[PDB]
Design an enzyme around this catalytic site. Structure first.
Site, PDB file in Angstrom:
ATOM      1  CB  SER A 171      42.704 -81.963   4.561  1.00  0.00           C
ATOM      2  OG  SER A 171      41.423 -81.399   4.320  1.00  0.00           O
ATOM      3  CD  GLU A 180      38.272 -81.643  -1.997  1.00  0.00           C
ATOM      4  OE1 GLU A 180      38.606 -80.609  -2.607  1.00  0.00           O
ATOM      5  OE2 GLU A 180      37.991 -81.666  -0.779  1.00  0.00           O
ATOM      6  CB  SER A 209      38.437 -80.098   3.985  1.00  0.00           C
ATOM      7  OG  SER A 209      39.197 -80.154   2.789  1.00  0.00           O
ATOM      8  CB  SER A 261      40.614 -73.686   4.130  1.00  0.00           C
ATOM      9  OG  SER A 261      41.387 -74.695   3.526  1.00  0.00           O
ATOM     10  CE  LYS A 272      39.314 -83.656   1.770  1.00  0.00           C
ATOM     11  NZ  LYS A 272      40.012 -82.378   1.554  1.00  0.00           N
TER      12      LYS A 272
END
EC number: 3.5.2.6
Lengths: 261, 164
Positions: A103, A139, A43, A210, A46
């Protein structure tokens, strides 16, 4: 060399692979550990997707107010803000904030899609002079973090330079840079990662990541008390597919490389 | 303690805001901000956030009733047996009962469940998260999972990641 030995022993005690890049903008000095090796961003990517949309808004200044439809087909394992708006819309501002502060995975995928897909986020990185960053997947699969897989990776050195250019330099327009910093500062998650190794008085704008193989990441811009800002990237990954996160390793690395500031 | 699956299961559709907080523990919960007039309750650290529940209500009123329950990483599947083959056996247009018999009665947890006409079930929307034998984690990255969603008890779509 003393800092290098402490990071090596931290990595050894942790059982995994650690990458660190600190930039001190007071003197442009760096502390580097495996800083040219590739790590799965998870993440932390992002930030780049949000920044690519901010860059686009320099040519379309109402862009963050444009609405995006959210549908059940969009949902991707973790999306605490977007799921509130299924069969409705969110603005690109709301999606950016949700990606950076919660997130949210749908938010990330809408930012990626808005600029044209993962290869377009990579092209944005290239336009900033970052030749290392690559975004390959959306994602949730961008988090697999398989050892040896270069998809969705960058190096600590490249990400620290790019985050500097984005949050402190001239990669974005002035208002866009302020907006990115506002979003990252307003992200109150990540307190157990880089921030846990810093004095409580310091101001931090970070984004954690993560993924598989116990991958535990954090990238941050840091304003120490009475000092020029720092950029810190800490990446960590482990040999076991089902390894648990080690946010404390990132806090430990942050303490090691900022000690004395 | 923090928000838990046991607390999520104890909370029922139709409860008031304060009944939700009685069970969840208001120290875990918030409203406003990105959550509007819903109530959002954090569990343990997981991923880049926390396991959580979000409860939606029939209105903003102080005594409105739960019409929506969403959760992430609060509930484990009781007997996950989903496979790629079983996922491929699921077909848009199936009823909820047909889907559950196909993927396994213990393979799924309820991701979101919303009654726009609460207490009526007309228009109910449902998202299930379903898992293979070792795909669920309450803390880390899923290792084989599917999203199955319904309106009025009819499967409208399916997606999967990493099933074998």
């Amino acid at each position: 060399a003393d800092v290098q030995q402490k990071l090596a022993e931290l990595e050894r005690q942790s059982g995994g692979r650690l990458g660190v890049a600190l930039i001190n903008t007071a003197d442009n000095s760096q502390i580097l550990y495996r800083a040219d090796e590739r790590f799965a961003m998870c993440s932390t990517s992002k930030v780049m997707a949000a920044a690519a949309v901010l860059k686009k808004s320099e040519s379309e200044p109402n862009l963050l107010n444009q609405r995006v439809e959210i549908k059940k087909s969009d949902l991707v394992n973790y999306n605490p803000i977007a799921e509130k708006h299924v069969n409705g819309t969110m603005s690109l501002a709301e999606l950016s904030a949700a990606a950076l502060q919660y997130s949210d995975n749908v938010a990330m995928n809408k930012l990626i899609a808005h600029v044209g897909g993962p290869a377009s986020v990579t092209a944005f990185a290239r336009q900033l002079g970052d030749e290392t960053f690559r975004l390959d997947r959306t994602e949730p699969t961008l988090n697999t973090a398989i050892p040896g897989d270069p998809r969705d990776t960058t190096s600590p050195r490249a990400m620290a330079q790019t985050l500097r250019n984005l949050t402190l330099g001239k990669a974005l327009g002035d208002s866009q840079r302020a907006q990115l910093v506002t979003w990252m500062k307003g992200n109150t998650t990540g307190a157990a990662s880089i921030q846990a190794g810093l004095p409580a008085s310091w101001v931090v704008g970070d984004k954690t990541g993560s993924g598989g193989y116990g991958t535990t990441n954090d990238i941050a811009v840091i304003w120490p008390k009475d000092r020029a800002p720092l950029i810190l990237v800490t990446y960590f990954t482990q040999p076991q597919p089902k390894a648990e996160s080690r946010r404390d390793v990132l806090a430990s690395a942050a303490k090691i490389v900022t000690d004395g500031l | 303690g923090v928000m838990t699956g046991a607390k999520f299961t104890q909370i029922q559709f139709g409860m008031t805001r304060q009944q939700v907080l009685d069970i969840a523990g208001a120290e875990n919960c918030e409203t406003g901000g990105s959550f509007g007039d819903s109530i959002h309750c954090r569990g343990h650290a997981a991923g880049d956030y926390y396991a959580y529940a979000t409860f939606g209500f029939t209105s903003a009123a102080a005594d409105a009733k739960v019409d929506s329950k969403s959760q992430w990483k609060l509930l484990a599947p009781s007997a996950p047996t989903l496979t790629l083959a079983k996922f491929n056996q699921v077909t848009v247009g199936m009823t909820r009962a047909q889907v559950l018999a196909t993927v396994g009665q213990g393979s799924c947890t309820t991701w979101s469940e919303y009654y726009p006409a609460y207490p009526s079930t007309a228009g109910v929307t449902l998202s299930l998260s379903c898992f293979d034998v070792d795909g669920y984690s309450s803390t880390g990255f899923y290792r084989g999972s599917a999203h199955l969603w319904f309106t009025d008890g009819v499967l409208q779509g399916k997606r999967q990641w990493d099933l074998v």
